[PDB]
Structure 1
Amino acid sequence: ASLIYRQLLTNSYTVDLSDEIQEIGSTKSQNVTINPGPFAQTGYAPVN
């Protein structure tokens, strides 16, 4: 009856195939890099 544990561990490479099957159906999206930092304070010029 331990064969169940042994085989569950052995035949685990198919988990990757299942993951690929899920991934292909997953909706994909991309993110762009965020401009970081203490942005310089620039204000209006002196006008009249």
Structure 2
Amino acid sequence: MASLIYRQLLTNSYTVDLSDEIQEIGSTKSQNVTINPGPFAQTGYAPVN
């Protein structure tokens, strides 16, 4: 029953703090985010004078 439950929920403190460092350094190493405007052009009357 809870022998292995409360065993494992404590033994894997190494997993949890390794996950902490993994997510932190991943957040440091995140890349850029770019959006595409989509299949729709945008234009108008340019030479206003």
Calculate the TM-score normalised by the size of structure 2.
Answer: 0.41
Kindly state the Cα deviation for residue 11 of structure 1 after the two structures are TM-superposed. 1.8
Runs ≥4 residues deviating over 2 A:
27-48
Q: Any gaps of 5 or more consecutive residues in structure 1?
A: none
Higher helix share: 2
Indicate the SS of the match to 1:2.
Answer: helix
Calculate the TM-score normalised by the size of structure 1.
Answer: 0.41
Q: 1:16 to 1:46 in 2, by over 3 A?
A: closer
Q: Any gaps of 5 or more consecutive residues in structure 2?
A: none
Deviations 1:1-32 (CA, angstroms, capped at 9, x unpaired): 43111111112111111011101122499999
Task: Let me know the Cα RMSD of the aligned residues.
Answer: 6.1
- Find the structure with the greater CA-based Rg: 1
- The alignment of Structure 1 onto Structure 2 pairs a total of residues equal to 48
Indicate the SS of the match to 2:40.
Answer: coil
2:12 is matched with: 11
